[PDB]
């Protein structure tokens, strides 16, 4: 049989918007996959989410030192750590590696698919567009979602289904905050 | 909640099976560090963090002790409601475009993990490859499930085929996800 | 140089 398990989670979540203008703290108390109590800094008091929570929220709100300490965590946890994100995480820039590779052996007037692989970049803001002879392809472009590699790098693959005619030039445009200019990578049909 | 940056300054985990727990911090979905609860050490996930950032691992041991206490109170209140096993979804891909001869890394994404107990191994030509294998901790999701990423630094060649083996309570048989050049 | 902190969980009152 499957072993029985009881899971408990506590998530201290900070939501930053517009630099340091808007900061929000939401601590979450989760039993298995049921969030039964939370503290929202925009509300100011603990609240029960499910009928499993009222005994917990009523007790934490009835403790002055606990309620004060949690309200101060907007400053002691969220705003304090965000200053260290500005010095480390938020200034991390990893330039993307852009390569084009056909899915099958290239043949003139034969169906093929070009994959523009944009690998190992950070942050996540990326913009990729396919072009054929200075004309943006917008019909045979199939893009995968943002692939998170888990090692603080991202990856995305944009695939273009096309038919290589004689003389065609296919360019993959990539824009990224780590780049001073938009970059391109060219791919030509072999003669 | 709409925001430019979301940080989990405290993903705290504790489960009765084991028992076992986990403490880590996340920023925009990426794990900054995890605290080894046994060795009482903070393990940052980037060289940049190890130079300018510091976290006392005793803070993690203090929090996990609260979760163990809270779990016992809520088990009684919930009339002993066990966790439901979720079926994990596995995806295998490479970190870079695979070219025969150039060293690459194989990535195995095991998503929708609950409860947070899973086995992730690698099989090269059937044989269980052990060297050059690493994985991340359990990363949090908004629906309070988890996902875990395992890595395999390999050398592409038409001689070798690879599989990611995943064992979970929600899976009747161990799930195998193949990857070939 | 300065140690960072996380959120502190409140303790259930089932003493």
């Amino acid at each position, epitope marked *: 049989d499957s072993p029985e398990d009881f899971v408990y989670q506590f998530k201290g979540m900070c939501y930053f918007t517009n630099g340091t203008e808007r900061v929000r703290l939401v601590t979450r108390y989760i039993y298995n996959r049921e969030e039964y109590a939370r503290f929202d800094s925009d509300v100011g008091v603990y609240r029960a989410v499910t009928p499993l929570g009222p005994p917990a929220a009523e007790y934490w709100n009835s403790q002055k030192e*606990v309620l004060e300490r949690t309200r101060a965590e907007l400053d002691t946890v969220c705003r*304090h750590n965000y200053q260290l994100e500005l010095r480390t995480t938020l200034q991390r820039r990893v330039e993307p590696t852009v390569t084009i590779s056909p899915s099958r052996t290239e043949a003139l007037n034969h169906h093929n698919l070009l994959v523009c692989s944009v690998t190992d970049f950070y942050p996540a803001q990326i913009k990729v567009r396919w072009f054929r002879n200075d004309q943006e392809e917008t019909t045979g472009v199939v893009s995968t979602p943002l692939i998170r590699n888990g090692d603080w790098t991202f990856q995305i693959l944009v695939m273009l289904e096309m038919t290589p005619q004689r003389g065609d030039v296919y360019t993959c445009h990539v824009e990224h905050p780590s780049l001073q200019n938009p970059i391109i990578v060219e791919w030509r049909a072999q003669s | 909640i709409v925001a430019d940056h979301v940080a989990s300054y405290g993903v705290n985990l504790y489960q009765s099976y084991g028992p076992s727990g986990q403490y880590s911090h996340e920023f925009d979905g990426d794990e900054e560090f995890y605290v080894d609860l046994e060795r009482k050490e903070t393990v940052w996930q980037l060289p940049l963090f190890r130079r300018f950032r510091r976290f006392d691992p005793q803070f993690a041991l*203090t929090n996990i*002790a*609260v979760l163990k206490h809270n779990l016992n109170c809520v088990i009684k209140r919930s009339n002993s409601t066990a966790a439901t096993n979720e079926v994990p979804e596995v995806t295998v891909f490479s970190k870079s475009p695979v070219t025969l001869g150039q060293p690459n890394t194989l990535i195995c994404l095991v998503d929708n993990i609950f409860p947070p107990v899973v086995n992730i191994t690698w099989l090269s030509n059937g044989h269980s490859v052990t060297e050059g294998v690493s994985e991340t901790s359990f990363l949090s999701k908004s629906d309070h499930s988890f996902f875990k990423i395992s890595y395999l630094t390999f050398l592409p060649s038409a001689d070798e085929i690879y599989d990611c083996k995943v064992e979970h309570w929600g899976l009747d048989e161990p799930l195998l996800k193949h990857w070939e050049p | 140089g300065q140690v960072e902190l996380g959120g502190g969980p409140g*303790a259930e009152s089932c003493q």
Partner: T-cell receptor
Amino acid sequence: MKTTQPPSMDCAEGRAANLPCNHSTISGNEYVYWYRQIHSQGPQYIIHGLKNNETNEMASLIITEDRKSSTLILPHATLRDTAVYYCIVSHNAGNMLTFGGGTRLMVKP
Amino acid sequence: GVTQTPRYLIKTRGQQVTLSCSPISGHRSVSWYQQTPGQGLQFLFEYFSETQRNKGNFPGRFSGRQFSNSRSEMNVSTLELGDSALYLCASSLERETQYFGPGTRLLVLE
């Protein structure tokens, strides 16, 4: 550890006593705590704070805007306030308390 | 406030002491300290939910325990002359302000 206090200080009875404390290495996540210990007694919690000002029935605490210094304010200094006052910092993270040298306050009648 | 018994204690070398502490009603965390004129306020251990959460740097002969009602007891084996101090007990809701008790004035003699 992170706090500097004068070793001794006198004040007039009835007037206000302003005990200073210096803590330039303080972190944005560390509170300023004040304890006092009368002879042959245990430490007595007085007041704590994070930023700016705080007041309770025992004393007042003023923290500078840059938070590099604080000052405990005893409103009506009585003869029973003659004790050793410890200015300490604490994360309020369930960790231990560390006491410094403290200030030896003497209330002169 | 926090209560501690006994308030004064005389012992000889090699004996053992058991000190009691009653935290403030509703508090769940109990910390023990040793206060000497020479070493100052030294931390022993902190207990929460009948379990030791934090641990100082004192040897194994300094042991503690916490009961279900959050009351705590502390034990010292093979008493040495250097153990003469005021053994203080601090009480807290969980991680917040620690309130001290009167302490046990322990004197170890030959």
